[PDB]
Symmetry: C5
């Protein structure tokens, strides 16, 4: 009930979704030769860890449970959204300090750069629509989970729905709070050895900036997320 509690559980959820994207990046590092959809699918299955963490442990992931809230019957969102952000950024910091970006001869870092960079090149509408698509999947996953009895039920019913949105490259704003900043940090602070390893340079990723993150992704994706969850809320009421 405490707003402090919620804030701590939202930070926790931010850390959890970062764990998920880290797993995704790890799983998909060096998979450029493998068929696109298969590599992404495996990445997405791995990503589901994060949602499983949130549900089993009771963390508060921005809007993920909106259908639960309606079923058992709201500016708390600002609290959760920002707590989420704080947790993601703390994990960005921890991941940077661990040296992980040099994993697989720097390919781990490159995977983050290219994944982060992809995410700031949508138009506003497609970003919104991918935000809609992503949260539809998350909210549905969380809903199914709640009809679950056992741990197995609650965790594993969420694997397919999550893997689908992730493998499909749909956009989740909180997940993005880890990924794009992680990309920005690497782009700005990577050693010369990393660039040599990876056959690239900072200027090849010139759109990976804070500004571009906020405007080309975070805003439209957050809007899209909100709409996605809203569509489900509004479908729920009629029923």
């Amino acid at each position: 009930k405490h707003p402090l509690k919620t804030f701590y559980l939202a930070i926790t959820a931010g850390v959890f979704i970062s764990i998920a994207f880290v797993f995704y990046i790890t799983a998909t590092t060096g998979t450029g030769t493998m068929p696109f959809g298969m590599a992404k699918l495996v990445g997405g299955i791995c990503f589901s860890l994060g949602l499983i963490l949130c549900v089993v442990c009771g963390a508060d992931l921005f809007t993920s449970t909106v259908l639960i809230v309606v079923a058992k019957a709201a500016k708390n969102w600002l609290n959760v959204y920002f707590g989420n952000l704080v947790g993601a950024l703390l994990f960005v910091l921890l991941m940077w300090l661990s040296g992980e970006y040099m994993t697989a001869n720097g390919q781990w870092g490159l995977n983050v750069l290219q994944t982060a960079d992809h995410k700031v090149h949508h138009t506003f509408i497609e970003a919104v629509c991918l935000g809609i698509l992503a949260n539809l999947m998350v909210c549905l996953a969380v809903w199914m989970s709640y009809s679950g009895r056992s741990l197995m039920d609650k965790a594993f019913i969420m694997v397919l729905p999550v893997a689908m949105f992730v493998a499909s490259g749909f956009e989740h704003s909180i997940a993005n709070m880890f990924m794009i900043p992680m990309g920005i940090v690497i782009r700005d602070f990577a050693s010369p050895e990393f660039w040599t390893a990876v056959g690239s340079a900072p200027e090849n990723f010139s759109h990976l900036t804070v500004m571009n993150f906020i405007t080309d992704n975070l805003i439209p994706v957050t809007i899209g997320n909100i709409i996605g969850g809203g569509l489900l809320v509004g479908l729920t009421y009629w029923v």
Copy 2:
């Protein structure tokens, strides 16, 4: 039993099956060098997402639960009764598919994997409009046999695990084998037509093809060459399982 509620649940199921096909397209994108059956099997496993969604969330997928209706009524119903909501669920389902088509087109998703995502839809849609009426009805009955069986098995489950994961194999079987489900095609084929009709020139370049390569992808061909025979096959397929179940 409210007519408008099932309409919303039908629209929901349409979105659910569209989600299934999108997932299928995603998983099978760029699988060209992969053994045909292996790629198709994995796509089929992913596709099961849609039926898991339908059943667990309580959505209304055209005829998928017909076997249940019988046993629930302890065997008390007639022809003219078992299809009151049928055109209701059907067109509702269609709206769901079409809506998700619009949304998927707006997402710019067809440019995924250098346009290979889009190309996958083109080819998948294209394949579904080159069937003989007969073989489409047959693929149609084969598909619905698998869906109805999957749904009947689900209903004997207790846990969430039971209800969901018993449907994976039978669903994945019909999808990997390229059997025909009318509603799922309401997304796939119009998705292909939209892409064909409205794809940028850069897509065509990236992929290395042309709109003239998919000259059979028209709205009319969709209706007459697929939707009609497949729907009829879906119906006969569900027909058989009903007659068998009855005598029990």
Copy 3:
């Protein structure tokens, strides 16, 4: 009873055919893949069929013989445990054949540039080239697995238990090329049908001719596979029945 049984037998023939269709789809185009891996996957898909039989209460020839012995409690005779075997066997056959017609009508055989169809031909053909004794032993092997799978399934207390306990034992027999008579009622005839009806196009895409599969005939199916395999399946069941009987008494 007998009429209800017959239909549940047709049902199982349908189910077992679905199993093999899935197997063929899964293994189509897997010539570059390691043999065992491709076959293992096909066998996991094939398990659908038995899952279908057990969960929907369908009647697959002899598959439950162990459950019946257990239910009798050792108060049963071998002479009673075979009245409706011929009924089930025949019903299974009808269902398998009906599915052969449905698969042929679908034109499914052209899938993957004729490769699906070719899969069936090569699979069917291989099944008609055993020695009689090879066929019998392969039949013993397949039915040990089927009977064990079904037996484990019956100790289950959820859908998950009953269905998934069978995946491994079924995959093992299918992946291993063991011989199950009912499954064969679909595969070999499906192959005979494709061979004697395939279009010139199929043969061109496939790169073969009907004369490459000269052993695929109804009579060769009956004598070189079905008889010995059926005998084998029966013996495989008998061994387990005999074993169970001793452990009980």
Copy 4:
């Protein structure tokens, strides 16, 4: 109780473990191109079927349930009691494995995949007879640690799902890693000797080898270089866990 019941159940487990190894051979046939550990892992997963059969159906696999026995008695039990049926089970296990060797030979399975199935058996059996005595013991210790742990975990299960699938990882681990289980080897190595001695000229031509290339595969080598030291290790590994169990139960 009753030596005869136990004997038949042991025959059954010997068949069960033979089924396990057949599945492993089938799954790993033609996996020369695959990464080694990946092929071995998949075979190991397939192999667990054998232990699943033994536990679910109630068969008696040499020493596999020794920790259950100790726990059910609350450690109020002597080694003589623990080992009371070992000779009988070991023998019965052997009879079941040899019966399965015969059936597999009569099946003609060795020609599967143009003889590669049979070749896989030969190479697998041959590898198992080239250990030093100490290596074979330690590999035996390792194998039976895993089997007994697997069976231990299975007994805390409350559903068929629990009991079966909890053994997958620990069995796959011992198998993928090439640890040595004596009963499993009663199928595998004699299967090798049999193929080596009775394979057709067509087989040898198909796989491009000759019986001369597998001259270590004899009954006496099987017994002295594998079965004896592996059986010793198996017992030692079970023993180590039994010791551990006694003590953890003793410490009130």
Copy 5:
């Protein structure tokens, strides 16, 4: 509660985690041509066996159950109470790991796959002593976060499937990602040091390398460049979660 029992269970957890890393080495042997991430993920999934063993059999793995201890007192316990038997458990853990090093060494396993199994250990171990101190601490924080969370989730489970399988993903995650767990490293790094110091000439030949290419693989480099910083990190990782847990519980 008994100290000697705890010690035996800590030796046991050391064995279980050693088993986990052996399985990881087995599955990833010869995987150099697979996508890096796929191979490590598979390895990581195999690795989860170790933790499944610890939880199912009630062995004591350094700090892994710290969150559960906090929950069982509704957060009404002190830091000093939490670390009460950390020394006992840490040393038991170590004894168990080292024992399994000795056994794996005597098994001759390092020659598996033409020495590739042993090469896999060398390179894995060697990697683990080339972090900066800060990196090793952070990698240690990261590994123990995932371990403590997995165990926490496992404790809300009711069936055996629940308790075991809920742990697969978070364990594979830390392992596939190359995060650093101190007890696991008590097997891995000493295993590499042993292979380096005692490998036959046949090994280095089959493997195309030499001991001088692994000059950092020493007991001292193990302690100072990995064990100390990684252990500190493991502790900080558990500490973070325990602190979060107090507050969640201290706010209704």
